Amino acid sequence: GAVALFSARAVDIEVFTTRPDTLFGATYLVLAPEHDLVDELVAASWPAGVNPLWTYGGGTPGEAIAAYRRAIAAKSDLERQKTGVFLGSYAINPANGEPVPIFIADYVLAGYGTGAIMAVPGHDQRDWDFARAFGLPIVEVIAGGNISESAYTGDGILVNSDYLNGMSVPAAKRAIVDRLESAGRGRARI
Numbered sequence: 001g002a003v004a005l006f007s008a009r010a011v012d013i014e015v016f017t018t019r020p021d022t023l024f025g026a027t028y029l030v031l032a033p034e035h036d037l038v039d040e041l042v043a044a045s046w047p048a049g050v051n052p053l054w055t056y057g058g059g060t061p062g063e064a065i066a067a068y069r070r071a072i073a074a075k076s077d078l079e080r081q082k083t084g085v086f087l088g089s090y091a092i093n094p095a096n097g098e099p100v101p102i103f104i105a106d107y108v109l110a111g112y113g114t115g116a117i118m119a120v121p122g123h124d125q126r127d128w129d130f131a132r133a134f135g136l137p138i139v140e141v142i143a144g145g146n147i148s149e150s151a152y153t154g155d156g157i158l159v160n161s162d163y164l165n166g167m168s169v170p171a172a173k174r175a176i177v178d179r180l181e182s183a184g185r186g187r188a189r190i
């Protein structure tokens with residue numbers, strides 16, 4: 001595994017990933033609904049042109065987050081066995097320097113890992129499903145499959161990943177951790 005920091009564009013969000021090699025394909029972040037940084041990161045207003053699917057029908061991000069927390073409390077074990085809300089704010093992907101939107105979603109569990117994930121819809125089917133439901137970008141960074149039909153979860157060759165390009169998955173995992181450590185923004189972890 002690895003832990004990595006994503007800076008708030010406007011605070012650091014630590015994610016745990018078993019696929020640090022896919023960092024150039026991380027197109028959004030997802031925090032557990034109960035994550036301690038959520039209230040900090042919530043924007044006062046929706047950005048202009050926000051996708052209505054992202055707002056939970058709330059007039060402001062704060063109202064939407066409060067409603068999401070209240071609603072998911074009405075779920076049972078049956079439901080818990082993809083929904084979410086945009087916080088109105090962005091983090092910076094440390095690999096490509098690009099802004100990525102921050103969500104909460106109940107598919108991310110508060111007391112596991114760091115309680116936050118980087119979402120890589122190209123290569124994690126859970127993220128693929130969420131991205132399709134919300135209209136988020138799906139980017140291929142591991143050649144081998146067909147991301148238009150499903151997440152590609154296997155081994156392959158790095159693409160669209162700058163200094164990782166051409167590497168195998170195991171080689172790319174080592175390279176990106178090296179880069180994270182040189183920048184002081186992540187670590188390999190068991």
Ligand SMILES: CCOc1ccc(Cl)c2c1[B@-]1(O[C@@H]3[C@H](O1)[C@@H](COP(=O)([O-])[O-])O[C@H]3n1cnc3c(N)ncnc31)O[C@@H]2CN
Pocket residue numbers: 016017018019022107108109110111112113114115116117118119120123124127
């Ligand atoms: C299992 C396959 O995981 C994959 C597979 C492919 C890819 Cl590209 C990735 C991941 B992985 O998603 C995180 C983390 O890595 C992985 C940790 O799962 P393991 O059971 O602890 O090994 O699950 C996810 N995870 C970490 N903390 C979590 C939490 N609190 N709640 C829900 N899921 C969490 O990162 C990427 C981008 N999503």
